[PDB]
Amino acid sequence: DELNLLVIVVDANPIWWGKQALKESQFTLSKCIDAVMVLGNSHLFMNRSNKLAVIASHIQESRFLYPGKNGRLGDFFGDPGNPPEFNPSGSKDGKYELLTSANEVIVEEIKDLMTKSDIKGQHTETLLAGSLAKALCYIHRMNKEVKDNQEMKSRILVIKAAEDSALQYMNFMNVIFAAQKQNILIDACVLDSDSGLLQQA
Amino acid sequence: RWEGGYERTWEILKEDESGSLKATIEDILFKAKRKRVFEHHGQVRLGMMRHLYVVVDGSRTMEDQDLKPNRLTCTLKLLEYFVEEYFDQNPISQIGIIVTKSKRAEKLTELSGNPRKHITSLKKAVDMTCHGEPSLYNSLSIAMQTLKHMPGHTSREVLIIFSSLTTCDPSNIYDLIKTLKAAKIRVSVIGLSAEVRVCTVLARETGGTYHVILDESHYKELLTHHVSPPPASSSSECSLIRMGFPQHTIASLSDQDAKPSFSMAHLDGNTEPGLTLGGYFCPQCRAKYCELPVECKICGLTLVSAPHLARSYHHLFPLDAFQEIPLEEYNGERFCYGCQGELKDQHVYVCAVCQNVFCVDCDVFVHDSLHCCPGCIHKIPAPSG
Amino acid sequence: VNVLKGVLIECDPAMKQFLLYLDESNALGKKFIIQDIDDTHVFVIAELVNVLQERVGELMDQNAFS
Amino acid sequence: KNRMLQEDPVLFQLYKDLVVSQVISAEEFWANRLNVNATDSSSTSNHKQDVGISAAFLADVRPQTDGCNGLRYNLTSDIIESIFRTY
Amino acid sequence: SRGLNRVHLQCRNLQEFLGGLSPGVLDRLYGHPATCLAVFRELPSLAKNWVMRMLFLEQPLPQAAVALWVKKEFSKAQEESTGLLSGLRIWHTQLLPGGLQGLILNPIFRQNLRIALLGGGKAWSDDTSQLGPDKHARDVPSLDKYAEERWEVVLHFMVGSPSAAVSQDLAQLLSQAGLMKSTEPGEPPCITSAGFQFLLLDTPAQLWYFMLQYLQTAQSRGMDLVEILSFLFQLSFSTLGKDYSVEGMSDSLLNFLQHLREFGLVFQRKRKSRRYYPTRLAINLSSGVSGAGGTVHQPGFIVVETNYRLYAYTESELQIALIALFSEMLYRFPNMVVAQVTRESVQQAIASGITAQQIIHFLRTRAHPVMLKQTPVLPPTITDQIRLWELERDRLRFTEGVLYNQFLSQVDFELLLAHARELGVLVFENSAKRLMVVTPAGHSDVKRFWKRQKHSS
Amino acid sequence: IINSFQSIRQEMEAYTPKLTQVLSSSAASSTITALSPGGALMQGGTQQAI
Ligand SMILES: [Zn+2]
Ligand SMILES: [Zn+2]
Ligand SMILES: [Zn+2]
């Protein structure tokens, strides 16, 4: 065999990642994501078929860090299957240029995330819940990409680093019960505090 | 005459736009044949904790093929799916599998929520002769006397699978209107490929909804129409009390392995004939047995397990709708707000409030699987107050 | 106390008795079958075994034909 | 009440130890055990091919009135009784 | 019997080769391009996690911690995943780091691997000559036709072309390979037995095998180089290069390249130079299995309903040739529906032996989108005909020798049976009828034992 | 937010945010600690049939 897709949800609370810098830590957000990046690459190292999905949680949004949303992948959209006939990024690959194909696109977009420190929306914290389904629609399309002798093994990673936000409790619970329909594993590493609600998930 | 006339039916069908592009628009009409009734929902009021009653006509009407090798094969197979998709949507309820066969009524599976018991019953119901004629009066008799002992704080609805035959039963079932109208029990039948006026009068005197089976796809539709807990008649109840919150038990809490098995005919719980090691715990009996998010037999209250069943309908009501536009406001870079693609089959799906752009595969994924627009999230919770 | 030598052929008894007939219908003197056993196991002077890869199936098909 | 406790050996096995271990009486056995199934469990012998038979069997009384010179006496209603249950 | 290892050998390619050579020679196999080569031609999921620690494990972790990484479930699968990973010689078993053997990887590969994990602008990453798209002078699907037709002029000229192959010395290696051969007058490029098997194969890894065996014929260049270059091909496509394969040249790197357009997988212009081109079809070499991607052309559905071969789709002549060996004698009109024979197609395996799976493979390779809406098993009769040819093949078996007579006493013949069985000239013992098998190869030894037995009387 | 804005993208700081085998041993430790729980009445049944 199957395709073995991965989904990764990373907590990026710049309030808390700023607070990660307030202790002047020996582990920062720069040190965080790079592990998570190669973690995403580690997925790819098991099989050429392996596919990744990465989305952090900005205070105003959750943009698809991976695959992309800009003119480096708005016209590229990956090399294997439905090719863009694009030469330079479509040229170099094999375990190391695929990652710098995706290394760039996270650090450029977290740059777009970490340039928006202008929050006035009354501490709009970790918006996990709506951020979850952003994968789930996309993999539904990716289910409809090819399925013909192609079992979609999706696997969802959730990463927690900060506290949960004050979001709608129903809209917390439901998508998990929708993921209960969806038959896809969800795994969770937290850093700072425990989430009784998300461990119920 | 007819040797021509048998093939005058083919003359037009086969022929189309000739020269070039032949057998093309015939395929277009087949796509134009599609796109049947979507939702037409938007309701309020009632629908909570149903107490359904499967009633099955077992008759000689089953021997006609008409959709499948048997009309039970049309029926019984998708009931399991109807069972599972019910327990998917509505776990706060329970269903009485009652079978009419040979002018009587057998309550086959009791009013309960244990799916395997209900499904294997249907798997037992495979090799049914369906000998004899339907009798609804025996079916309503069980339906009365069982639901008579149910509280008036219970949703009282009956789902009858009738094979459209003669309602072969005495004893003034026309007078069972005032019996059951007073008893506040709803009765819903759907006819198998035909109509029974008396039963059609029955349901229109009920408030239960009657239909006729058209096709196997259409058979699914009305099942799906009756998956949802419907807004039945007013003045049923308000509340339902002593919803027992349980405990999971790990049986490793303080005394590690002090009990070889937590079912030895004396322990509080251990209800069903099988061995157990301690997984569960009810408040009122303090009943420890095999885990069940329903109810018990000694405390007799409702074993509510909130994340499952107090969550299911808890977002099944508060929905809104989208809109469709064929236009090109190119929001994104000709993208989707959800899955982020494009085909442009002129169905640019815009939310009513947050007004975000979606596709069919994003609309369906909401309107069948997600049940809400997450574009309202980031848009509701940030100014929420 | 004999080096002997030969080529082992393993087949169903139906054919293990048949090679005796091929020994009796050998054009040369007996070489294919020094002796036979209940066990499906024979010994052949290795000359035309490569030909007997196809000399047998060309023969049994024809004999049954008529 | 006694045919109920003999035809059902499991409930009889339940009914044994209230006499064996002398838990309760038979007067107390039929006072708080049954009380609902007097309509539910007794709904078998009363109905029996829909009693108060008016329009259920009457469709089939004429075609099933004769198999042979002695094709009769099936079970209880078999092929003769509900003829008597109308006139 | 017949060889059956020359078809697949897809982990031993990096094991039986590598373990067949020295650690220092496979130390050369830790070129930084050769790093991806290690992880993927092995396919365990279990060793594929035992690596994942070592980028964070400089320390030799104790053996028991990973020997007991996985409990009672699939201890054999853990053990089967273990010694093979050890058989890669990538590990070092430490002696007594803390008191007991605690295993660890070769660090020079860990050096080489971590550059292919994070960071490194090194010689394969950048800085010398790697790759270069300057301005588009030539397109890939045009070159995909080259990546199709060179396979033809490979695979057709195997069978034999009414056209001609290009001027290669490769045929003198493919005749050397035992795929092809040629008798001495005129040197006819025929097939011996094995190209026929490779005609039944469809992946480039056999070509790769003879290209690994390319240096083996008394050639002394970089086997280190070419297998790096074997990876260095495996970069998809989309790169012309400002002659970047000459800026990253070497001796065999350019000469054997002249052969990669003979092998077709590179495309070289005027003077065999000025650019380089990796072709799109490199994915098949790594998989080395049937593969859904291995469909070549998509003709349609088949069936063999009523075992009567039942199909159409006027295809190219190679498939017509693929059944010219397999179905003539009531061939039909445009649709390629040669009827069935339970004898002739049965006789058409006699020059092959059994094509048991090779039926079943060409069952799912006759018309390729047949598994789209059909039943999982289509023929309960083609499999049976192949089984009958199996029993006939078992009857056919052959070897060499002569006979002796007068064995005499029964207990004396049993001692002679153990002499030829230990040396390996006796397949089995005819104890009841006193018959013994000796190959001419072991004649002196068997005769000497017989004389010794006669002396011991 | 403005500080480590630039710090992520350079990834020279995030080149070597890996080599701490000091923090491998403890990371190996509670692995091995949870790899072997002991002393908890393995045979808990075997009078349960009686
Ligand atoms: Zn209680
Ligand atoms: Zn959409
Ligand atoms: Zn919305």
Would you give an account of this structure?
The PDB classes it as transcription. Keywords: mediator, preinitiation complex, transcription. Chain B has 385 residues and is an alpha/beta fold. Chain B contains 12 helices and 11 strands. In chain B, the strands form 3 sheets. In chain B, strands 3-2-1-4-5-6 form a 6-stranded mixed beta sheet, with helices on both faces. In chain B, strands 9-10-11 form a 3-stranded antiparallel beta sheet. In chain B, strand 1, helix 4 and strand 2 form a beta-alpha-beta unit. Chain C has 66 residues and is an all-alpha fold. Chain C is globular and about 45 Å long. Chain D has 5 helices and no strands. The longest helix of chain D has 12 residues. Chain E is 38% helix and 1% strand. Chain E is built from 21 helices and 2 strands. The longest helix of chain E has 20 residues. Chain E is globular. The two termini of chain E are 39 Å apart. In chain E, 22% of the residues are buried. At the C-E interface, helix 3 of C face helix 19, helix 20 and helix 21 of E. The site of one zinc ion has 4 residues of chain B, from loops.
Comma- or semicolon-separated keywords:
part of a larger assembly; 6 chains; B: alpha/beta; 6-stranded mixed beta sheet; 3-stranded antiparallel beta sheet; 11 strands; E: about 450 residues; mainly alpha; about 40% helix; binds zinc ion; transcription regulation (chain E); DNA damage (chain E); Tfb2_C (chain E); RNA polymerase II general transcription initiation factor activity (chain E); nucleus (chain E)
Summarize the entry for a quick read:
Chain D: It is found in: Nucleus. By secondary structure, chain B is of the alpha/beta class.
Layout of strands and helices, then pairs:
This is part of a larger assembly, with 1 copy of chain A (201 residues), 1 copy of chain B (385 residues), 1 copy of chain C (66 residues), 2 copies of chain D and 1 copy of chain E (457 residues).
Chain A: E1 7-9, H1 14-22, H2 29-44, E2 54-55, E3 64-66, H3 97-113, H4 128-143, E4 155-159, H5 169-182, E5 185-189, H6 196-200
Parallel strand pairs in A: 1-2, 1-4, 4-5
Antiparallel strand pairs in A: 2-3
Chain B: H1 2-5, H2 8-14, H3 25-32, E1 51-58, H4 71-89, E2 94-101, E3 106-112, H5 115-124, H6 136-148, E4 157-162, H7 176-182, E5 186-191, H8 197-204, E6 211-212, H9 216-227, E7 247-248, E8 280-281, H10 306-309, E9 322-325, H11 331-334, E10 348-351, E11 357-358, H12 360-370
Parallel strand pairs in B: 1-2, 1-4, 4-5, 5-6
Antiparallel strand pairs in B: 2-3, 7-8, 9-10, 10-11
Helix pairs in contact in B: 4-5, 4-9
Chain E: H1 23-27, H2 34-41, H3 47-50, H4 63-67, H5 75-80, H6 83-87, E1 91-93, E2 103-105, H7 107-115, H8 140-159, H9 171-174, H10 194-199, H11 205-212, H12 223-233, H13 244-247, H14 251-262, H15 283-287, H16 317-324, H17 344-347, H18 356-363, H19 382-396, H20 410-423, H21 443-456
Antiparallel strand pairs in E: 1-2
Bound molecules: zinc ion (3 copies).
PDB class: transcription
Keywords: preinitiation complex, transcription initiation, transcription
Entry title: TFIID-based PIC-Mediator holo-complex in pre-assembled state (pre-hPIC-MED)
